[PDB]
Each structure stands twice: as C-alpha cells, then as structure tokens.
Design an enzyme around this catalytic site. Structure first.
Site, PDB file in Angstrom:
ATOM      1  N   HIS A  22     104.267 131.938  34.708  1.00 26.17           N
ATOM      2  CA  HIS A  22     103.229 132.913  35.055  1.00 26.17           C
ATOM      3  C   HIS A  22     103.477 134.273  34.391  1.00 26.17           C
ATOM      4  O   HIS A  22     102.595 135.130  34.397  1.00 26.17           O
ATOM      5  CB  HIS A  22     103.161 133.073  36.588  1.00 26.17           C
ATOM      6  CG  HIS A  22     101.775 133.163  37.161  1.00 26.17           C
ATOM      7  ND1 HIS A  22     100.661 132.609  36.568  1.00 26.17           N
ATOM      8  CD2 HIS A  22     101.347 133.692  38.331  1.00 26.17           C
ATOM      9  CE1 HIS A  22      99.603 132.823  37.331  1.00 26.17           C
ATOM     10  NE2 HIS A  22      99.994 133.475  38.408  1.00 26.17           N
ATOM     11  N   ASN A  70      98.341 138.796  41.451  1.00 24.44           N
ATOM     12  CA  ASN A  70      97.022 138.732  42.079  1.00 24.44           C
ATOM     13  C   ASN A  70      96.395 140.103  42.350  1.00 24.44           C
ATOM     14  O   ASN A  70      95.251 140.177  42.795  1.00 24.44           O
ATOM     15  CB  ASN A  70      97.055 137.869  43.352  1.00 24.44           C
ATOM     16  CG  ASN A  70      97.774 138.535  44.509  1.00 24.44           C
ATOM     17  OD1 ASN A  70      98.634 139.396  44.317  1.00 24.44           O
ATOM     18  ND2 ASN A  70      97.438 138.121  45.727  1.00 24.44           N
ATOM     19  N   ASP A  95      99.241 133.349  30.811  1.00 26.59           N
ATOM     20  CA  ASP A  95      99.500 131.916  30.854  1.00 26.59           C
ATOM     21  C   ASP A  95      98.205 131.149  31.084  1.00 26.59           C
ATOM     22  O   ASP A  95      97.348 131.581  31.857  1.00 26.59           O
ATOM     23  CB  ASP A  95     100.506 131.574  31.954  1.00 26.59           C
ATOM     24  CG  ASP A  95     100.119 132.146  33.309  1.00 26.59           C
ATOM     25  OD1 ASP A  95      99.872 133.371  33.402  1.00 26.59           O
ATOM     26  OD2 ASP A  95     100.089 131.380  34.296  1.00 26.59           O
ATOM     27  N   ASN A 116      94.800 133.799  38.781  1.00 31.21           N
ATOM     28  CA  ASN A 116      94.716 134.838  39.817  1.00 31.21           C
ATOM     29  C   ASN A 116      94.849 136.276  39.317  1.00 31.21           C
ATOM     30  O   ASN A 116      94.384 137.199  39.978  1.00 31.21           O
ATOM     31  CB  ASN A 116      95.753 134.596  40.918  1.00 31.21           C
ATOM     32  CG  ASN A 116      95.374 133.452  41.835  1.00 31.21           C
ATOM     33  OD1 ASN A 116      94.195 133.233  42.116  1.00 31.21           O
ATOM     34  ND2 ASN A 116      96.374 132.726  42.321  1.00 31.21           N
TER      35      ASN A 116
HETATM   36  O1  URI Z   1     106.767 136.705  46.083  1.00 35.24           O
HETATM   37  C1  URI Z   1     105.571 136.589  45.642  1.00 35.24           C
HETATM   38  C2  URI Z   1     105.281 135.494  44.839  1.00 35.24           C
HETATM   39  C3  URI Z   1     103.991 135.356  44.325  1.00 35.24           C
HETATM   40  N1  URI Z   1     103.051 136.198  44.695  1.00 35.24           N
HETATM   41  C4  URI Z   1     101.640 136.084  44.237  1.00 35.24           C
HETATM   42  O2  URI Z   1     100.974 134.797  44.147  1.00 35.24           O
HETATM   43  C5  URI Z   1     100.389 134.681  42.880  1.00 35.24           C
HETATM   44  C6  URI Z   1     100.020 133.419  42.081  1.00 35.24           C
HETATM   45  O3  URI Z   1      99.290 134.001  40.985  1.00 35.24           O
HETATM   46  C7  URI Z   1     101.617 135.265  42.333  1.00 35.24           C
HETATM   47  O4  URI Z   1     101.929 135.071  41.116  1.00 35.24           O
HETATM   48  C8  URI Z   1     101.622 136.563  42.869  1.00 35.24           C
HETATM   49  O5  URI Z   1     100.463 137.367  42.903  1.00 35.24           O
HETATM   50  C9  URI Z   1     103.386 137.285  45.499  1.00 35.24           C
HETATM   51  O6  URI Z   1     102.482 138.106  45.816  1.00 35.24           O
HETATM   52  N2  URI Z   1     104.593 137.444  45.971  1.00 35.24           N
END
Ligand code: URI
Length: 193
Positions: A22, A70, A95, A116
C-alpha cells in the site's frame, strides 16, 4: 497546463508500513526525490512530508500525505489548493490491485478502483488528475484485500515492482514537460523481462 508540477505518493506513515504494498506510491516518490535531489521535509501545515525542487528545468512539488491512507485527501486537497495546482498538473502514484507486480501504467481520469487513498481525493478535486498505477496484484478474494495491501511482498514481486518503478522514474522528464501522451505510451509499454 498539463506540465506535471505536483507529484503525490500515497501510503501510510510509520516504519511498520514502509515496506507494505500500500506504500508503493511512497516508494516511487522517495526514489524520485533522491534522483533529483529534492528534499522531503516535514510539512505539518499540510499533514504530510513535502518537497520542492527542479526536475529537468521545471519547478515541481512532491507530497507524501502523513494522514494514513484513507485520509489522504486531508493533505492533498489543501496542499494543491494553497499552491494553486490544478488536477491536470497532478500525478498521484499509488498501488494498483487490478494489475500484476511489474506492470505499471499512466492513467488520466477515472475512478478510485476501490483504492481508499484515491477515494478520499477524487470527491474534492475531481477525477482529472494523472495516476501512476503501480501493479501490486490482488489477493484473489474480496475480504483478503487488507492483508494483501498491508503485506510485505515476496522478493520476486518486490523485484518486479522495483523494476517498474525504476522505469517510471526515467519517464518523469516527459511528464514535467507536459508530454503526457508519450509518457503514457512509454510507461505502459514496460515489461519486466
Ligand atoms: O493502523 C492502521 C492501519 C491501516 N489503516 C487504514 O486502513 C486503510 C486501507 O487503505 C489503511 O491503509 C489506512 O488508512 C489505519 O488507519 N490505521
């Protein structure tokens, strides 16, 4: 016009995410910054890390949102608005689940394709920015996407992505010069072997 003058790399902050699929966008922009000697420094105002420098005689800004993926629009949108950079002059590297590792494509317009990061950007600035779609593969099933994008790719897949990213770096000259059609042709034609 369509002289690319903002290059955004999407990803998540923190060492635990730095090697995950990602963060493909981060990899590209970090490598581009090193290639052209653009300093990526802390940018608290725009919730990111950003830089400004000369690429092939053009004044270009680089941006890595530090918002988590996100929430990427919470960096990109105010940054682009402050510097009066229109979407048509923005390249966002990200990605791409719908493409193989080692496949890379330049796209203009279109939706987020389930991504996202892009999902948080397009509602505000519209779709007419350019995207460097860095293939990362799909985990097959729908509910395994998180485990895939937040996973560290096996060495062969990493090698394939790294080669594609390196190829794209060589074509940024075309993009900052506004040669989007030629850049698209030459980027999309990339083969790993
Ligand atoms: O610890 C985290 C792991 C992931 N995400 C969110 O979930 C999204 C999937 O796009 C992530 O990449 C990121 O925005 C978080 O907010 N916190």
């Amino acid at each position: 016009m369509s002289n690319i003058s903002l290059i955004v790399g999407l990803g998540n902050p923190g060492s635990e995410y730095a090697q995950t699929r990602h963060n493909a966008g981060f990899w590209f922009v970090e490598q581009l910054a090193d290639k052209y000697g653009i300093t990526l420094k802390n940018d608290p105002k725009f919730h990111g890390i950003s830089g400004r420098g000369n690429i092939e005689g053009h004044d270009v800004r680089l941006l890595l949102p530090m918002t988590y993926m996100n929430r990427s629009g919470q960096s990109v949108v105010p940054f682009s608005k402050f510097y009066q950079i229109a979407p048509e002059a923005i390249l966002i590297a990200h990605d791409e689940l719908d493409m193989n590792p080692g496949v890379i494509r330049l796209k203009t317009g279109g939706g987020h394709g389930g991504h996202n990061g892009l999902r948080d950007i397009v509602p505000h600035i519209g779709p007419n920015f350019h995207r460097l779609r860095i293939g990362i593969g799909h985990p097959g099933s729908k509910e395994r996407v998180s485990g895939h994008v937040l996973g560290k790719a096996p060495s062969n897949e990493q090698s394939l992505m790294d080669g594609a990213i390196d190829h794209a770096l060589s074509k940024v000259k075309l993009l900052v010069q506004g040669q989007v059609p030629q850049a698209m042709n030459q980027i999309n034609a990339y083969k790993p072997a």
